Every structure is written in C-alpha cells, then in structure tokens.
Amino acid sequence: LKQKELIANVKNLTESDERITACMMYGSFTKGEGDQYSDIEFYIFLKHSITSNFDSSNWLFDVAPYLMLYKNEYGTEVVIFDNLIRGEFHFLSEKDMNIIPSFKDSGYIPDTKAMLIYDETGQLENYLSEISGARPNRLTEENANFLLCNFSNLWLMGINVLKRGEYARSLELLSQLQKNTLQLIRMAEKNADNWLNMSKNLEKEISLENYKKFAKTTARLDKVELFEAYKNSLLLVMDLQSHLIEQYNLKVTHDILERLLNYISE
Amino acid sequence: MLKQKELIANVKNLTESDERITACMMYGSFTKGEGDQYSDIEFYIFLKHSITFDSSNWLFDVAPYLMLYKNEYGTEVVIFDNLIRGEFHFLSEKDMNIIPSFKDSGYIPDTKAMLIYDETGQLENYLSEISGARPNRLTEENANFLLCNFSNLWLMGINVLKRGEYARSLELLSQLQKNTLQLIRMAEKNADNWLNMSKNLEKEISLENYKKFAKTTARLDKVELFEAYKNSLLLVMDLQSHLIEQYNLKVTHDILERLLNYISE
Ligand SMILES: [Mg+2]
Ligand SMILES: [Mg+2]
Numbered sequence: 361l362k363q364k365e366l367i368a369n370v371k372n373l374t375e376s377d378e379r380i381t382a383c384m385m386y387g388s389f390t391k392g393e394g395d396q397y398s399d400i401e402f403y404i405f406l407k408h409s410i411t412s413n414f415d416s417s418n419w420l421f422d423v424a425p426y427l428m429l430y431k432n433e434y435g436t437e438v439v440i441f442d443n444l445i446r447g448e449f450h451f452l453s454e455k456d457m458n459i460i461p462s463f464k465d466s467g468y469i470p471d472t473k474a475m476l477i478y479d480e481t482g483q484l485e486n487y488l489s490e491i492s493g494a495r496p497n498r499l500t501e502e503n504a505n506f507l508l509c510n511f512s513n514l515w516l517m518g519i520n521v522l523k524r525g526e527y528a529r530s531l532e533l534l535s536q537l538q539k540n541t542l543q544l545i546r547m548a549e550k551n552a553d554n555w556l557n558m559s560k561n562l563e564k565e566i567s568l569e570n571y572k573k574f575a576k577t578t579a580r581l582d583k584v585e586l587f588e589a590y591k592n593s594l595l596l597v598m599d600l601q602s603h604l605i606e607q608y609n610l611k612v613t614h615d616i617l618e619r620l621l622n623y624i625s626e
Numbered sequence: 627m628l629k630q631k632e633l634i635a636n637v638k639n640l641t642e643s644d645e646r647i648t649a650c651m652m653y654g655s656f657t658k659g660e661g662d663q664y665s666d667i668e669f670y671i672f673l674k675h676s677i678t679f680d681s682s683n684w685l686f687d688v689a690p691y692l693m694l695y696k697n698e699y700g701t702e703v704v705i706f707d708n709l710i711r712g713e714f715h716f717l718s719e720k721d722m723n724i725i726p727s728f729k730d731s732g733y734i735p736d737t738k739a740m741l742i743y744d745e746t747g748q749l750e751n752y753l754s755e756i757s758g759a760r761p762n763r764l765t766e767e768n769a770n771f772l773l774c775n776f777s778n779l780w781l782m783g784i785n786v787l788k789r790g791e792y793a794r795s796l797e798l799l800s801q802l803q804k805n806t807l808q809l810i811r812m813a814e815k816n817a818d819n820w821l822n823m824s825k826n827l828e829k830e831i832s833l834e835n836y837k838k839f840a841k842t843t844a845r846l847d848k849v850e851l852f853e854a855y856k857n858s859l860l861l862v863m864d865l866q867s868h869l870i871e872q873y874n875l876k877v878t879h880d881i882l883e884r885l886l887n888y889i890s891e
C-alpha cells in the first residue's frame with residue numbers, strides 16, 4: 361500500500377528531525393483495519409519553544425509531494441498527496457501530550473503498540489499505557505435517555521420545517537437524526553464500540569433487519585421522500601424504544617412517540 | 627393567536643416578575659419577522675449571579691412540558707405539552723457580555739423584538755451594539771476554506787463509498803452538502819444565512835442551483851450514492867469557475883478534474 365510507504369516515511373522523518381519530540385498514530389492503521397481506501401493520521405509533538413513557527417508546509421512535502429494542504433476547523437493540517445492519499449496531521453507542543461489520557465473516553469483501544477511511532481523521552485509510551493485497553497461503556501440509561509430526547513427534539517424540528525416547505529433544511533435535520541438512530545441501533549444490538557464513528561463498518565456490524573429499517577429513513581431532496589423518511593425514522597425509533605425500555609428507565613415513552621406520530625397528519 | 631405567542635407572553639410575564647431574573651433576550655425567527663406556526667421559541671435568561679436555579683421548575687411555570695433535556699451545546703431544550711419546541715439558555719447576568727459577539731454569527735435586523743425584559747438597562751446597551759450588524763462572508767479566506775474542505779470530505783466520502791461503507795459515505799455526503807450550500811451562497815452573493823445555510827434555501831438561491839443541489843442528494847443505495855458524489859463534484863466545478871474570477875484559490879480546475887478521474891479509478 362502507498363499509505364504504508366507514507367507511514368514509513370513519517371516514522372523516518374519524525375525520528376531524525378530535532379524539531380519533533382514524539383509521534384502518535386491513530387485510526388484504522390492502528391487497529392488492523394487499514395486498506396487502500398484509508399487515510400493516514402498522526403499527532404506530531406513538537407519541541408515546545410519552536411511550536412508556533414514550525415514549518416509544517418515544508419515538512420509535509422518532505423513526507424511526500426502534495427496537491428493540497430489546509431488547516432481544518434479543529435486546527436489539524438489536512439493534506440492530499442499527489443498520489444491522492446489523504447493525511448491528517450495534528451501538530452502540537454510536547455507539553456500538550458497530556459491530552460492523550462482523555463482519548464480513553466473516545467473509543468475502544470484494545471492495543472497501543474501500532475500507535476507509538478516515535479517517543480524521545482519515554483513519556484508518550486507512558487501516556488499510552490494509561491489508555492491501553494480503554495473501552496467506554498455505552499450501554500447506559502444516560503445514553504438511552506439522551507438519544508431518545510435528542511431524536512424527539514430533532515424529529516419534531518425536522519417535521520416542522522418540512523411542513524413549512526423548507527425541504528433542504530428538513531433534509532439537513534434528517535441527517536442529524538440518522539446519526540442518533542445509528543447509536544440507538546448500536547445500543548439495542550449491543551455493538552457500540554464504534555460510537556462517535558457510528559456509521560463505520562455498519563454493513564458488517566448490525567443485523568440485516570435494522571440495516572434495512574435504517575435504509576428506509578433516508579431520502580433525496582423531495583417532499584414525498586422526506587415525509588416517508590421522517591415517518592419511517594419515527595417507526596424505527598418506536599421499535600428501538602420498546603426494546604430499550606426493557607433494560608432502562610426512559611423519560612421518552614411510547615405515548616410521547618405516539619403524540620409525534622399523530623402530529624405528521626396535523 | 628399562535629400557540630408560540632401565548633408562550634412568549636408567559637415568558638415575558640415570568641421573567642419580569644421573578645426577582646432572580648435580571649434580563650431576558652429573545653432570538654431566532656420571532657425577532658427576524660419570520661416566525662410562524664411551525665417555529666420554536668428561544669431565549670437567553672440572565673440570572674442574578676448568586677442564584678445561578680432550578681430550570682425545570684421555572685419552565686413548568688411557563689407551561690407544562692413533555693420532555694426537557696440539555697443538548698450537546700448546554701442549551702435546555704423543552705417540548706411543551708402542546709408540542710411547541712422551546713430553547714432556553716440560563717446564564718449569570720455577568721455573562722451578558724457574550725452579546726456583542728452575536729454580530730459575528732449573522733445579521734441582526736431587530737434588537738427591539740429581542741428585548742423581553744431588562745431590569746438595569748444593560749441588555750438594551752449590549753443590544754444597541756449589534757443592531758443592524760452582519761458579517762461579510764464574501765472573502766478569499768472563506769472561498770479557500772470551503773473549496774479545500776469540500777475536496778477533503780469528497781475524497782474521504784468517495785473512498786469509503788468504494789470500500790462499500792455505504793452508510794458512512796451517506797454521512798459524509800451530508801457534510802459535503804453543507805459546504806456546497808455555503809459555496810452556492812458565496813457564488814450568488816446571498817450569504818447572510820451562513821451557519822444556517824439551509825434556511826429559506828428554496829427562496830434564497832436560484833432555481834438552477836437548487837436543482838443542481840437536489841442532484842447531490844441520495845438514499846442509502848450504492849448507485850444513488852455514486853450519482854450524488856459525481857454531481858456534488860460537478861456542481862463545485864461550476865462554482866469555483868465563478869469563484870476563481872473574484873478570489874485567488876488554492877483549489878484549481880485541474881485539482882477538481884483529478885478528483886473527477888478518481889471516481890473511475
Ligand atoms: Mg483513517
Ligand atoms: Mg481520518
């Protein structure tokens with residue numbers, strides 16, 4: 361893979377460059393899930409006193425020639441190499457390495473070995489032992505209640521703008537409630553490790569039954585398809601709620617969802 | 627009388643008589659002349675510093691509600707028992723100074739309708755700072771970010787699509803759609819509705835671009851997803867050919883064409 365060649369380049373450069381103290385890889389190439397369609401992604405930790413004016417534009421071209429480079433909304437350097445492989449590079453001071461422990465709240469990290477690319481002082485290796493084996497429990501009454509409330513809120517807002525005739529806006533809201541729906545399916549089916557990245561591997565991770573029901577909650581920009589998608593997403597959530605009520609105390613009840621159902625006609 | 631106007635009246639009544647409340651500010655469509663039967667209601671409630679308060683008790687006094695939670699942004703969101711949606715921020719009076727920053731997020735046509743209650747006169751003072759104001763979205767910085775962000779998300783979305791991660795590509799497509807709407811609004815110079823880029827879209831962009839945008843949408847289906855991604859790129863190619871004449875752009879026609887060629891690769 362071209363991306364494994366780029367990874368080896370990153371490993372080579374981060375170890376030899378005096379400006380760089382540590383390098384941590386994340387994403388699919390750290391979990392055995394990388395393929396030809398994958399990106400590459402790293403945190404690059406810099407010597408504190410040169411962090412501000414670090415020439416990332418030049419350094420990244422030293423990794424490989426690129427077509428395009430920009431800083432995204434979260435302050436990550438995002439690159440498209442001339443071979444069309446995407447790379448995400450988060451440049452921070454060595455002193456901000458203390459953000460690493462918070463990564464234990466973000467997902468399943470069974471192994472940490474592929475994450476350590478370079479570690480000058482030993483401190484990256486210690487931070488990673490803090491997150492190794494992390495596995496947040498998503499199957500909580502708090503998640504189920506937040507998701508059902510959020511869904512009801514988004515669904516009602518979406519149906520309102522749809523009734524108004526704001527079709528594009530109801531479509532945008534529909535995509536937000538789809539994300540909510542995936543997390544709920546993952547709760548109902550107890551396959552919730554892919555939590556923030558809820559659509560990742562969906563085709564391999566959920567029952568055909570719920571996958572098809574989810575497919576029915578999608579729509580193109582068209583009034584009839586939108587009304588159909590909204591009704592189906594409420595019907596799906598009604599199914600998910602009757603399952604989740606067996607294991608959690610829910611503030612959103614069938615009678616509340618029933619009020620939303622009757623509203624579509626009004 | 628709209629159900630929301632009776633609720634607004636109740637909010638006015640309660641905030642002006644409660645000793646714990648220093649000020650009340652309304653925002654959204656009912657302060658922009660766009661409120662209707664499908665609208666929600668929304669307010670910042672500013673509290674005496676020492677008591678910053680049980681919101682659920684107070685909100686029940688506005689009207690009985692079916693559900694109340696805090697959204698991902700810390701806002702209290704309520705569905706009243708007549709199905710009207712309300713969004714309430716409870717903050718200390720000392721946070722009233724966030725008000726001048728509102729001119730950074732959009733056009734402020736009517737600060738008179740925004741003032742619900744103002745014990746000290748300070749709310750009116752902050753509001754007068756933002757009256758008539760709006761950001762100018764028509765910049766090289768915006769065109770560059772959006773074209774770059776689009777290309778990033780498009781390449782990522784097309785990759786997961788080729789992998790056969792259909793639901794993931796659909797999620798990314800909706801992120802692309804938002805970028806595309808901002809780009810259309812730049813190209814057509816109608817950019818007030820920026821953060822809320824879908825707002826009044828049917829009324830605010832040309833029919834030609836609306837129909838092009840409609841072709842960038844898909845259901846959860848391989849064929850429809852490929853069609854949407856292709857059309858997404860072709861629309862952006864149209865847009866940057868307009869944008870290149872006004873701004874110096876990092877994303878060139880040649881780059882977009884390499885992306886177009888990649889669809890079949
Ligand atoms: Mg990745
Ligand atoms: Mg990535």
Ligand SMILES: [Mg+2]
Binds near residue numbers: 654656665
């Ligand atoms: Mg509103």
Ligand SMILES: [Mg+2]
Binds near residue numbers: 654668713
């Ligand atoms: Mg609102």
Ligand SMILES: [Mg+2]
Binds near residue numbers: 683686
């Ligand atoms: Mg009471």
